[PDB]
Design a protein around this ligand. Sequence first.
Ligand SMILES: [Zn+2]
Length: 1010
Amino acid sequence: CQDVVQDVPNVDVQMLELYDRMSFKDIDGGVWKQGWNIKYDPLKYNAHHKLKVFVVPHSHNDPGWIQTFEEYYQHDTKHILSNALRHLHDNPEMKFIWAEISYFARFYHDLGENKKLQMKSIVKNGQLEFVTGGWVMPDEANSHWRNVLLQLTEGQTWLKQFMNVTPTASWAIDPFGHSPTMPYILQKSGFKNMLIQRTHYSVKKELAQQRQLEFLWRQIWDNKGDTALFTHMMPFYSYDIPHTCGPDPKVCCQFDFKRMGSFGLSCPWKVPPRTISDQNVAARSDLLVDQWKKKAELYRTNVLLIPLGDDFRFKQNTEWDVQRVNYERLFEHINSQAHFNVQAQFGTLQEYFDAVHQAERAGQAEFPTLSGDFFTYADRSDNYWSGYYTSRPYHKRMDRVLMHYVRAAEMLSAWHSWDGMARIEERLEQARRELSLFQHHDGITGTAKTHVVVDYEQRMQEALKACQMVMQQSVYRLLTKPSIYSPDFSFSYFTLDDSRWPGSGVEDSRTTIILGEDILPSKHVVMHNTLPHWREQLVDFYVSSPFVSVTDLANNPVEAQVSPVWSWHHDTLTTIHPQGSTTKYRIIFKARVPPMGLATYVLTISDSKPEHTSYASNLLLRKNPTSLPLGQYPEDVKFGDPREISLRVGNGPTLAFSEQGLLKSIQLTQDSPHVPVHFKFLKYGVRSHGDRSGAYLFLPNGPASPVELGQPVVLVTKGKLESSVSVGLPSVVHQTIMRGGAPEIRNLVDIGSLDNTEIVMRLETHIDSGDIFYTDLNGLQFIKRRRLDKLPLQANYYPIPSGMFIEDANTRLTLLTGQPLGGSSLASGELEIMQDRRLASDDERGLGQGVLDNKPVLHIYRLVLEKVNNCVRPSELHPAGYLTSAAHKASQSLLDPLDKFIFAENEWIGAQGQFGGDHPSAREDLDVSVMRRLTKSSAKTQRVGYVLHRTNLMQCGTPTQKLDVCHLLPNVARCERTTLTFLQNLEHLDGMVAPEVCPMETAAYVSSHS
Ligand SMILES: [Zn+2]
């Protein structure tokens, strides 16, 4: 294994170092507004060295944006694909590339048997070519790497079964900035080439000047270079026809033949296209070849890519004819005139890449190496696209919940083959496809119309219910004696309890377990642990009585705590204040669950305070208190005036809070200093003159201003197992929760009718971080950031898909997230992260609406303060950072918590105590990211697929069983290493053993069973 800490990779272009050197000037470059007037040597090309030009027709089809998936399918995409089939069949020289498999699969299943055969023949002969072949073209900023792989797998599994093809070239023309997570996943999935478009106008200019727009893109930690993927970055402002022929859009627009005649379109530069004739073809070819030779000066070979398309193009038979016939008349003239020294023709993306690599092997070019990312994107002036890191944060949070439920449903159901009557495969295909659709660059981004967001939310809600049904049937099968198990596949044996989605203050839908010494004195509950190591964690349930004791199924007592149930309400006379339930209570205890396993507990009612259950105290801090009854709860609420508070659970850290209920300090141990750490809430506004913020753009009117808090009401709950401080602020109920290690932070965010406001949560410390901070990419890797005062505030905002940290020589503070949000370090010792944004104006990128559809959301975090002076850190020149053990486990507690199940009926005949006690407990840096049965019950050879991910953790001194996934299931007959999509066998494994993967590596295995 490579060492990913000590050796700094040597690359030609390192994006952090390039950013530090660049001046970012926004000069008028002439017809190429953000570049310069390109010149070429006309003697560069002759009889023996010609320019080869590939014109690649395409159509950008969004699976939801202005219309829903189904509205676009019926009104636009089914006509595009029907006309593609007819025109390519009739015109063998015509070519077309296709990206979005969600639409292609919907179309193909609706075709008659004769049309399916014709479609297969234009794919087999290479006229219709699939590019990427994902379900969608995903967002690269907010998306988790697990979901990027899920949607790639859904589309490529469909293409292999139905079209017998697997793309090796990727096409990503519309995501709002680009991540190195994509080449990481694509290179481990059989790809050879990829293309990107939306990068900062300043970066396009700097790379074009050095002919560094084609590069070998490696990971920031990769010293050897085996992660490298060949990447083509397009040079100009857009992927439309005016910005793809060459540097002058007033010329290129005249070669978009839909912008004349009866289509109702036109050229903004005021010179229309003209039909190509014998009379004009020499003059028209003179201007067009000059644009081609200028574009070719920006690249290193004699092979040139010219895309030809736009949004939902090639809808009409007449559009295919007017584009094909005028281009054919230009190609026939140009190819027949030796003075041009050009060969031009319709082609595909793979055709382009094959010809470039042939030119390279001929010794025509040697390509540069590059590491880094392409965030944050700007298309013009100070218009940085950091707004969509936060827009529609309710759905961003829902993405992470559905990610975990799909993993848990696939894993729990994989242990067995199921009868077709159970409909397990139907429910899991629905769930995978709804989560896959939401990865689209107008889904998770929050950049769709209000009615389109409602469609995404309804689809994700159906997917959640499908996962719940699979999970509960699987738990019953796994923990019921085989002598008793006799299933009704329609029946609810268990209901799921989730404390964190949507959250009891968002939707008060948790089930209360109702116990009574007569009617029903006990209830069985079951915890699942998807992680491949033993886990102990606190769990809670709602119960109808405070007098409840916990046992394991063997009747061993478990120490428990009871707390009241609290809700928060606006008083119309005055204040935001808490109200206690008189009818339900929380029971809280530590569950111990095997790796990838299950554990059963029992809740039992009694007359009075039972021997192994304690009761939290509650203190309400407010002047002029009124009474707060709590029904049977045995401890009276205490009252006081606002004051500073300190709390400690177990022998974990001591936290101190201000009179307003906000953190002010952390002490790690009894001996150590009180380290200042202050939470604050601030607000950004919108510019009254000049460019307005919208769903995409963040354009603040200066630095954030303090929120006036008044004298808010503070509630302190103190228990042996769990304590919290909760405060009612304007727009936010803010909670700090303590269970004996790093605290958990919960914000119930309701921005209400506060038009043109963005709410930010900031941390202030004396950590001497200077201009340096770290943010993650897609939940996979931490990248070093440098704050730049020469760029505006909105340019120093980055995606926070799962975490961020600052550090000096001695101390680090990490904030882990349960949802992707936008964030920064705008001053030494600070972290900040945006909670919600409400915007009255459109930002002129095509959405045609502001963001005024906000709803309450529960955001969740962990906060980890650590000493790092005894840690082996990367050298100052390394562009990556790495989490500690404690911060990594804190992230895992937010993204993949224990699942909780309540038995639905009065009696569970044949109940068992535990599943998976024999499972291997793997090293803490290893995860089983995916477990998925690949075969239905009728297959004679069963196949199960596993994705294994090993992260890299910092070594800090304080230093388990070998996991072989090929032997988790009995009767293993073969074990293969595969691409991450499971579609190609790469290696038949010695001894049917799936080996140990290296730090920062991901591998896929398939086990076959007799
Ligand atoms: Zn798009």
